[PDB]
Design a binder for these strands. Structure first.
Ligand SMILES: [Zn+2]
Ligand SMILES: [Zn+2]
Ligand SMILES: [Zn+2]
Ligand SMILES: [Zn+2]
Lengths: 72, 73
DNA sequence: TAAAAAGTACACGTGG
DNA sequence: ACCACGTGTACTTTTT
């Protein structure tokens, strides 16, 4: 089973979406915080296990488009 | 009129490893050349490297260091 | 007596 | 919670 945000090994159904632990914690942190992230490319970065660290802007966007939300 | 880092356009501090750079790019290059680091670009290998965004893509930042001529000797 | 460039070390923030 | 890791500033050493 695979995190729909980064393709790492999923941990569970977190905030609506099958995701890994790091993406779960990441999303909670992004929402619940003054987080003004800026993409260095084209707001279309690749989010896999390594690259996910590179662009929190695109990882968060992808969290959202995947449907994550703090309310179930 | 102040000196600009040829890698990231922050204010340079001096000529480091052959190239006019900021302190941050001086030590970033040294670390990249001496350590073995798996840098991948999440974009198209043309990410914007400025003071605000240089942390996002080490792979592109290192490539620009190289292209600019930085060398450890 | 000093500037430039190289080396070293501490604090910090994000991430897992 | 807690530690690893990348980063950037500031300091010291070496160089000229
Ligand atoms: Zn994930
Ligand atoms: Zn991006
Ligand atoms: Zn720079
Ligand atoms: Zn890049």
């Amino acid at each position: 089973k695979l995190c729909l945000v980064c393709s790492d090994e999923a941990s569970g159904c977190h905030y609506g979406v099958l995701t890994c632990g790091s993406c779960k914690v990441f999303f909670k942190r992004a929402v619940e915080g003054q987080h003004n992230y800026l993409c260095a490319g084209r707001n279309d970065c690749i989010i896999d296990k390594i690259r996910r660290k590179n662009c929190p802007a695109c990882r968060y966007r992808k969290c959202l488009q995947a449907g994550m939300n703090l309310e179930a």
